[PDB]
Design an enzyme around this catalytic site. Structure first.
Site, mmCIF file in Angstrom:
data_model
loop_
_atom_site.group_PDB
_atom_site.id
_atom_site.type_symbol
_atom_site.label_atom_id
_atom_site.label_comp_id
_atom_site.label_asym_id
_atom_site.label_seq_id
_atom_site.Cartn_x
_atom_site.Cartn_y
_atom_site.Cartn_z
ATOM 1 N N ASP A 1 -9.201 4.087 -1.019
ATOM 2 C CA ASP A 1 -10.744 4.126 0.619
ATOM 3 C C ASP A 1 -11.551 5.015 -1.050
ATOM 4 O OD1 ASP A 1 -7.521 3.487 1.188
ATOM 5 O OD2 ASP A 1 -7.330 5.682 2.039
ATOM 6 N N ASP B 1 0.861 -1.294 0.441
ATOM 7 C CA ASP B 1 -0.093 -0.364 0.026
ATOM 8 C C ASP B 1 0.795 1.804 -0.220
ATOM 9 O OD1 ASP B 1 -2.319 1.574 0.439
ATOM 10 O OD2 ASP B 1 -2.368 1.340 2.639
ATOM 11 N N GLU C 1 2.447 4.733 -3.739
ATOM 12 C CA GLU C 1 2.265 5.860 -5.067
ATOM 13 C C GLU C 1 3.355 6.604 -6.102
ATOM 14 O OE1 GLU C 1 0.104 5.492 -3.324
ATOM 15 O OE2 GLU C 1 -1.527 3.938 -3.951
#
Ligand SMILES: [Cl-]
Ligand SMILES: [Cl-]
Length: 925
Positions: free
Chosen positions: A584, A507, A510
């Protein structure tokens, strides 16, 4: 959370976006605009499937030019590739500002990261015609494709079937920003340093964007470029009712409380677009890893697209532009959606063979707070007869947000916890992110630093910034050395507390940087190779998932097995590496509805192992919303419930009756269909076939399907689902694509036959709207079990769904779910064909009948039940079928049930008793 109120660049706040939109505005406003780019024809040569030439860009009124090498490749697949580079930068004849050590050349390693096949040049491609103004190359299957390259102004038309389908530079928007020094004159406000979000980009290269207009001639619908909260059929971006006003953006980012119906970037990017109309499909893949924007307009082909006096046929105009790198574009001419996606998967990879368990239900939240919390949830799922495969640990399981540690207070016996899960064949997934806490007494950060494995700043220092652990450094997974080091951290004997049922969630990749601009790294950070972060940003997540994938192949001597890795950030090719989810999301009905077009867009962009958080991440879903979300989520290829730290506990047994029973029925349906889900993943692996398929894909001849994104087919089953995604709805209108018979999965009611139409189906809370199309066979497992592993040796049921032809086909793929033995033939793959009153099973690939341990054990596993829906009336009164298998022939009892009201006639054969790995023939009637 660190950021409360986030700042995202609008197009006007991104310098190179502003410049490319302005370039388009000027070109569309100019009278007789000519692209200032010409092929110098004497520099051109064609040989052995490739054209190479020099494009001259005129850069001032004195007629000064710069040289931009062009390469056009014609591949054996029938795909073409167009690449434009910049000779001065290839040569290194520029000067970077600020004493920067960043690479001078245009980033040219996207291919290295993304492309795995498909690159063989077609020596059958040929120049059909060639003068001093243009040339046409014939290529593709039987020379049916053509590219007409015009020299002055430069353009390329790609043709088949007597028409242009894709045009490059028809509007003259080609823009390669050639290198220039920073000089004050003897609009450059965005050329150099730019500030946003508390950061100044030093911009050592100056302007270097690459852009092009790509027109889809006669197409009114375009699709792809995930991930966005947006319809499957992409919207226009230059205004109008129901359209967007800013381009679609691809710049992987951690977007807090992302909104619905927006072109704003999300967490991953796949710059692959298709155009579909009735019986014709084409596409392009824009192989660039930098920030990329795509404008889309639609109208007539005239310069004023609302003009009178012209033909009405619509052209979709798209304008692509990337911050840096090569202009590098693959062109697919189809002619079907299946063709295009197959060819794209040959280039960028097919879906990896998944761990079988990963198709089951995943239970997650932020956080399970202790090893005892985990063990308690596990027990309660079983108490409530809710099957599941995996329990997940979010970031609070670590010691103070140090990856490769456990919280000693709260997770004192992780091996015990693992072993409890193992008692039902269940798995544990642990989060591991790329930010490594900058703290003392932590060997992982010591090694990251001393081995030069961290991302660097603009001046070559180790980059530091904030995330969950506070001050952190980031692994630079572009560096092969960093990937190799990462492998060593996951060995079971190194990552204490992990074992053979532990898999990994990646996670914040990015990368998410809480104090960085747009919550990410400065554009002038430096990576391995001395590439700027701007050059490679959209690859970053994929490099990290790659590192983790390869770390899970072997974690002790002699182990070799399939990884399971979930990622947030991703790029083209991430399908080779594991699953994604849409980040999310929010616990509200609009996000449940939006999930389906998002997950569909993933699969048609070649990354189908995709889902959204069931229940929604932020907030507290109402009980009905949660229940409907399970009924949708059982159709996500990646099916996980997850919840934010402030959200109430909502493990499914907490919902209350009647919701518990409805949710459990949904779970049982997912599990029953696992044989067919796994087979759908096999097809994604074989040839890039989407796992859930939109109407444009299954029904390319049916124009009305193009804007449909709320219903889909499952794998190769003919199952058509339309989940309810609206509050207080008790019916659903399903679009019936064609004239085939469609049956309710549960009742066998005939919902439609003979003509494409919209059918209204009763759909109270307790109903999952699911139809079976005639002409298909699919397998399921009827015996309910607590986990997928506990189903492994159970008998199969085959459902044969007949229309008026009384003919059907389907298939079933099974293997050990874990190893790479499938590569050496250790699998069962059955093709089932019903025709002329006979059901046969044959090896799917036609292999001749060396059995390993798993194949041997499968000899105990049978097809035991066959249900025929749409059974012909002539079978009435016949009390047996004749079964033949492995040289033995016998009768099996069949029960015939006549049609009754709108319920189909159906027949059931019980205790068939044929081993699933063997040929068989069963004669009915
Ligand atoms: Cl030059
Ligand atoms: Cl299909």
């Amino acid at each position: 959370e660190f950021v409360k109120e986030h700042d995202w660049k609008k197009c006007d706040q991104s310098g190179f976006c502003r410049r490319n939109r302005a370039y388009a505005d000027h070109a569309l406003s100019a009278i007789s605009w000519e692209s200032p780019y010409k092929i110098a024809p004497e520099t051109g040569s064609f040989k052995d499937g490739q054209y190479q030439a020099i494009i001259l860009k005129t850069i001032n009124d004195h007629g000064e030019t710069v040289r931009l090498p062009l390469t056009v490749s014609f591949l054996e697949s029938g795909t073409a590739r167009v690449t434009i580079d910049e000779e001065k930068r290839q040569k290194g004849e520029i000067e970077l500002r600020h004493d920067s050590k960043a690479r001078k050349e245009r980033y040219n390693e996207a291919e290295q990261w993304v492309i795995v096949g498909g690159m063989t040049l077609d020596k059958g491609a040929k120049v059909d015609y060639e003068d001093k103004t243009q040339m046409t190359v014939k290529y593709g299957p039987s020379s049916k494709f053509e590219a007409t390259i015009k020299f002055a102004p430069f353009s390329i038309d790609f043709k088949r079937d007597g028409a242009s389908h894709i045009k490059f530079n028809d509007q003259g928007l080609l823009n390669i920003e050639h290198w220039r020094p920073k000089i004050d004159p003897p609009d450059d406000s965005t050329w150099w340093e730019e500030s946003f979000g508390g950061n100044t980009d030093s911009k050592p290269r100056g302007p270097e964007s690459v852009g092009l207009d790509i027109s889809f001639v006669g197409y009114e619908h375009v699709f792809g470029i995930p991930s966005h909260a947006s319809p499957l059929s992409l919207k226009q971006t230059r205004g109008g009712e129901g359209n967007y006003n800013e381009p679609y953006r691809m710049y992987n980012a951690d977007v807090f409380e992302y909104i619905l119906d927006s072109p704003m970037t999300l967490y991953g990017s796949i710059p692959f677009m298709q155009a579909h109309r009735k019986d014709s499909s084409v596409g392009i893949f824009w192989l660039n890893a930098a920030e990329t924007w795509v404008d889309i307009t639609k109208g007539k082909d005239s310069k004023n697209p609302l003009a009178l006096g012209v033909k009405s046929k619509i052209t979709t105009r798209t304008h692509w532009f990337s911050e840096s790198g090569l202009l590098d574009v693959f062109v697919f001419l189809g002619p079907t959606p299946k063709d295009i996606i197959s060819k794209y998967a040959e280039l960028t990879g097919t879906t990896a063979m998944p761990q079988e368990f990963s198709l089951g239900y995943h239970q997650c939240r932020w956080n399970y707070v202790s090893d005892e919390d985990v063990k308690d949830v596990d027990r309660k799922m079983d108490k409530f007869n809710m099957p599941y495969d995996v329990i997940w640990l979010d970031i609070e399981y670590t010691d103070e947000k140090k990856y490769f540690t456990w919280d000693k207070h709260s997770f004192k016996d992780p091996i015990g916890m693992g072993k409890q899960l193992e008692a039902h064949g269940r798995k544990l997934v642990t989060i591991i992110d790329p930010h490594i806490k900058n703290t003392n007494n932590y060997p992982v950060v010591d090694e990251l630093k001393s081995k030069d494995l961290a991302v660097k700043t603009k001046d070559g220092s180790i980059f530091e910034g904030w995330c969950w652990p506070g001050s952190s450094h980031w692994i630079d997974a572009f560096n092969p050395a960093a990937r190799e080091w990462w492998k060593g951290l996951f060995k079971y004997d190194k990552f204490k507390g992990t074992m053979e049922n532990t898999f990994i969630w990646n996670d914040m990749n990015e990368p998410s940087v809480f104090n960085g601009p747009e919550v990410t790294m400065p554009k002038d950070n430096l990576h391995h190779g001395n590439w700027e972060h701007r050059d490679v940003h959209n690859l970053n997540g994929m490099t990290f998932q790659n590192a983790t994938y390869h770390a899970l192949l072997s974690r002790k001597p002699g182990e070799h097995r399939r990884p399971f890795v979930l990622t947030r950030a991703f790029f083209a090719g991430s399908q080779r590496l594991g699953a994604m989810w849409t980040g999310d999301n929010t616990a509200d009905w609009g996000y449940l509805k939006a999930s389906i077009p998002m997950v569909l867009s993933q699969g048609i962009a070649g990354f189908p192992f995709a889902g959204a958080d069931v229940g929604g991440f932020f907030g507290n879903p109402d009980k009905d919303l949660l229940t409907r979300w399970y009924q949708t989520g059982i159709f996500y290829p990646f099916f996980r419930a997850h919840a934010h730290i402030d959200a109430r506990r909502r493990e499914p047994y907490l919902t209350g009756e009647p919701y518990n029973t409805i949710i459990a029925a949904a779970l049982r349906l997912r599990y029953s269909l696992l044989p067919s889900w796994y087979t759908a993943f096999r097809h994604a692996h074989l040839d890039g076939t989407p796992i859930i398929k939109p109407m444009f894909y299954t029904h390319p001849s049916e124009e009305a399907g193009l804007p449909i994104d709320d219903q889909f087919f499952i794998g190769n089953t003919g199952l058509l689902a339309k989940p309810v995604t609206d509050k207080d709805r008790t019916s659903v209108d399903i679009w019936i694509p064609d004239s085939e018979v469609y049956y309710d999965y549960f009742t066998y009611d005939i919902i439609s036959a003979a003509k494409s139409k919209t059918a209204t189906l009763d759909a109270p809370l307790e109903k999952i709207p699911l139809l079976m199309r005639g002409g298909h066979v699919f397998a399921r497992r009827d015996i309910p079990r607590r986990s997928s592993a506990l189903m492994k040796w159970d008998p199969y049921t085959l459902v044969v769904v007949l229309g008026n032809d009384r003919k059907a086909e389907g298939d079933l793929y099974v293997d050990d779910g874990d190893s790479f033995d499938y590569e050496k033939g250790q699998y069962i793959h059955r093709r089932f064909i019903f025709d002329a009153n006979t059901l046969t099973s044959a090896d799917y690939e036609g292999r001749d009948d060396k059995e390993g341990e798993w194949l041997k054990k499968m000899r105990t596993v049978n097809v035991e039940k066959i249900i025929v829906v749409g059974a012909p009336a002539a079978w009435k009164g016949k009390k047996t079928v004749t079964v033949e298998s492995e040289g033995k022939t016998w009768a099996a009892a069949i029960e015939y049930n006549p049609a009754e009201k709108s319920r189909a006639a159906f027949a059931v054969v019980k205790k068939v008793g044929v081993r699933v790995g063997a040929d068989f023939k069963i004669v009915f009637g």
